[PDB]
Amino acid sequence: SMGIVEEAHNLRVVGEGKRGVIVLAHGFGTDQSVWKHLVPHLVADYRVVLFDTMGAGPTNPDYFDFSRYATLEGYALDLLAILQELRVASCIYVGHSVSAVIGAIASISRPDLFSKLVLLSASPRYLNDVDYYGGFEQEDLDELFEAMGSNYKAWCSGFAPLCVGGDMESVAVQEFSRTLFNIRPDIALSVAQTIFQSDVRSLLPLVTVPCHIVQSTKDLAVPVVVSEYLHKHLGGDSIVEVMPSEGHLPQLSSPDIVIPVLLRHIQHDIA
């Protein structure tokens, strides 16, 4: 064991390849299992680090410090502690949903630790603003948080199909509904509020490591224009690939389409 960082985040390292280190970081409502279809494609060429974000279902709620995680910085500090403990000189970081922004934030502090960021289903701001389309108004958020607080289980059951998209009887929808409901309900409401009310747009000019912006063409939480926004405001080189998939966790729900795209963005560098 690497110690508390491993135990607290259920951290695992798999693969024996020599081309680099990859760190995979999941979105709200899921856990490292979201990467189950990607990892087999990476173990020949890479060492792959998987971990659960603090507050995720599989983590000990006693380690959830509300003051630490009241901003997204807390999660970025956790990521930097993982990379420091692993003695990583450099990694390829793939961040899903909120973990995309968490990696971007961490890369501002320590750009040396990241050769590239793959930003999957990423958004710097969910709320609409003047000349900015995120996909949500405050009233939408308020209605969502009221549903979460009124019956969390029912909310999970209704939200998962919308978020995952596609056929509501799919194994992916069922998996996500269960991982959503694994989060302790106080942590879930708090975290959803923190993430959905976030706005990191003014930090994007500080991100200088190359970014690969990948998303579904139809995503509940991420209008396609957000990818263009990211591409036009990140402070370093970037590329955008909008996939012919639907859903916010497309690496889980449509891996036949999505895993080839993620593998390409991991293997090929922008000029």
Degrees, nearest 5: CA angle 110-30-98: 35
Polymer length of the chain:
271
Q: Where do breaks (C to N over 2.5 Å) occur in the chain, by preceding residue number?
A: none
In contact, 235 and 266? CB cutoff 8 Å:
no
**Token pair 């990694």: residue:** 91
Please confirm, yes or no, whether 219 is among the known catalytic residues: yes
Please confirm, yes or no, whether 112 is among the known catalytic residues: no
**Active-site residue, selected from the candidate residues 78, 248, 253, 265:** 248
Please confirm, yes or no, whether 96 is among the known catalytic residues: no
Strands (E), 53-208: 91-96, 114-120
Distance of CA 140 to the CA centre of its chain: 21
**Active-site residue, selected from the candidate residues 26, 123, 219, 245:** 219
**Active-site residue, selected from the candidate residues 97, 99, 121, 216:** 97
Q: What is d(CA 82, CA 145) in angstroms, rounded to the nearest whole number?
A: 31
Q: Residue 181 to residues 13, 56, 190: CA-CA distances in angstroms?
A: 26, 10, 14
What is the CB neighbour count within 10 angstroms for residue 108? 17
Q: Which residues are catalytic?
A: 97, 219, 248
